[PDB]
Design a protein around this ligand. Structure first.
Ligand SMILES: *Cc1c(COP(=O)(O)O)cnc(C)c1O
Ligand SMILES: *Cc1c(COP(=O)(O)O)cnc(C)c1O
Ligand SMILES: [Ca+2]
Ligand SMILES: [Ca+2]
Ligand SMILES: [Ca+2]
Ligand SMILES: [Ca+2]
Ligand SMILES: [Ca+2]
Ligand SMILES: [Ca+2]
Ligand SMILES: [Ca+2]
Lengths: 299, 302
């Protein structure tokens, strides 16, 4: 049994890659698309909310407000449905329309900003909305320690247990930097020799080249006006990148060859991982790729 | 470790779907548990039947590495087959009309399916199906409507999971029907282990074939039969009664489940759940343990 969909968050499957040539290393994909909200962001939605509740920051009529690229809004929408909280999301109009439709299916109210101004414009508009709300809580995923902490506590522990502590490499897409940073932090505390790499869009190479740009790898990229506080760059053994088209193409390779329907960021992160494997061919490495969301919302 | 989720392929993710208790919607003093078949990696219960139909055919020798799998279907069965065939490297052709959603067409194509489009009735699909058979040296047609591996998969897995998760404490099972396989396979097994259990199929109120002997238009995707006729895999001798749901109520309940429970099920989940609520209300405060099958997740209908 589960008492609610909240009990289904986490404990996601880790699936071996069998048909794609992985160059004498084993690649496993952690399917965060299996979460009830269809993304890893269910984990951070749950922890940011539950810790706020414990700290006395959320009453039953507190309005939760958050700027999001989409999946955090979906995870929050779903949790707020179960908990009967009111959620308002500020988001860019440039994201997949399926994100909006998913949030609205859970009863979430969406306010739209100009996508060409990035997540900075969402964070700005959220300040304006605060003035009309008598009682609110802003999870603030780009600074809230409970974003990476969720991954440190659950995601990483699931990887360690499922692979019985045999993990050589962990590769993960970045937006807030929380899933990479929290998971890599725990992994490195237990496995001192593990290598952990973040991936960013080749068209918005903030970490590897020092500038941003438009890209199509939804959920990835840093557009708040700097590197998020929750990103811990000291954990990165190197910065990996992926082009927009290669991400789309790899997303299709995964579905055609593995029956894995991941998002565009999954295509990006997996491409980066497969390239890494090719560069480190025939070492018998156990390589784990975080698939941040499922692909249904991008078709 | 023993309670971990390491998987060899997405095939290992099929089945073992969770039961979730309903807490916020009034269920009238009975306990309603929804079995979320949307948790399957192809997002519906049809992964179970796609898996069993293909694997039994492999075992029979009906599928060689170069056998083309061919099925005339516009629904979740096509998706389930597509995903399975992606993993197993079989060529799949799915025949469906001109007039179907890009939603499902694109999902099937994402797994590598050749979707062949005809003119929208089903009669024109069958002639294309016959034409493709004639063009292929080797083929296998699963035929979800006649293949006993449809209900057998549910008899073997779906029903056993329900018994295990509720420690054999199940009073009522309610399930939407299209092929009738999930209802008939699951109810068969549950009744063998639990002789007092009541088992009810649900059909669309505006296509009440089983309850009133005719077909009509409805919007409960995945449910409903054709004439055509009642599929071979439906076993009406298991049905304690036939329940129905109108289109409007199915959509409303779909919305209610996502708003109040954070459960995003398909239209048939709304229909089946509405039928179970109407049943639970006629039997209020009996502490009945009622299981509803949620056949797919709701994303594709948004
Ligand atoms: C948020 C998100 C990411 C990046 O994850 P972070 O933990 O924020 O760095 C990648 N892909 C998708 C689809 C996302 O929603
Ligand atoms: C196939 C399907 C049904 C009906 O299930 P059967 O086992 O064919 O009777 C109900 N809902 C959806 C979404 C389906 O795809
Ligand atoms: Ca240590
Ligand atoms: Ca190092
Ligand atoms: Ca390119
Ligand atoms: Ca009551
Ligand atoms: Ca045999
Ligand atoms: Ca193929
Ligand atoms: Ca193909």
């Amino acid at each position: 049994l589960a008492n609610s969909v909240i009990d289904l968050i986490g404990n996601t499957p880790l699936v071996k890659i069998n048909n794609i040539d992985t160059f004498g290393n084993e690649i496993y994909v952690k399917l965060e698309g299996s979460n009830p909200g269809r993304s890893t962001k269910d984990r951070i939605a749950l922890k940011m909310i539950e810790e706020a509740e414990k700290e006395g920051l959320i009453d039953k009529d507190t309005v939760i407000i958050e700027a999001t690229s989409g999946n955090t809004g979906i995870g929050l929408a779903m949790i707020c449905a179960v908990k009967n909280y009111k959620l308002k999301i500020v988001m860019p109009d440039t994201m997949s329309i399926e994100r909006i439709q998913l949030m609205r299916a859970y009863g979430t109210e969406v306010i739209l900003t100009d996508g060409s101004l990035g997540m900075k414009a969402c964070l700005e508009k959220l300040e304006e909305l605060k003035k009309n709300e008598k009682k609110y809580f802003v999870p603030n995923q780009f600074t809230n320690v409970n974003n990476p902490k969720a991954h440190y506590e659950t995601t990483a522990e699931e990887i360690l247990k499922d692979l019985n502590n045999k993990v050589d490499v962990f590769i993960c897409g970045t937006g807030t930097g929380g899933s990479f940073s929290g998971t890599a932090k725990k992994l490195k505390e237990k496995l001192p020799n593990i290598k952990t790499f973040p991936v960013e869009p080749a068209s918005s190479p903030l970490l590897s080249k020092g500038y941003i740009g438009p890209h199509k790898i939804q959920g990835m990229g840093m557009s708040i006006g700097g590197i998020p506080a929750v990103y811990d760059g000291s954990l990165a053994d190197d910065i990996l990148v992926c082009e927009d088209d290669d991400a789309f193409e790899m997303m299709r390779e995964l579905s055609f060859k593995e029956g894995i329907l991941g998002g565009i960021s999954t295509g990006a992160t997996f491409k980066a991982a497969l390239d890494y494997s090719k560069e480190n061919a025939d070492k018998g490495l156990k390589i784990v790729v975080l698939s941040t969301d499922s692909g249904e919302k991008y078709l």
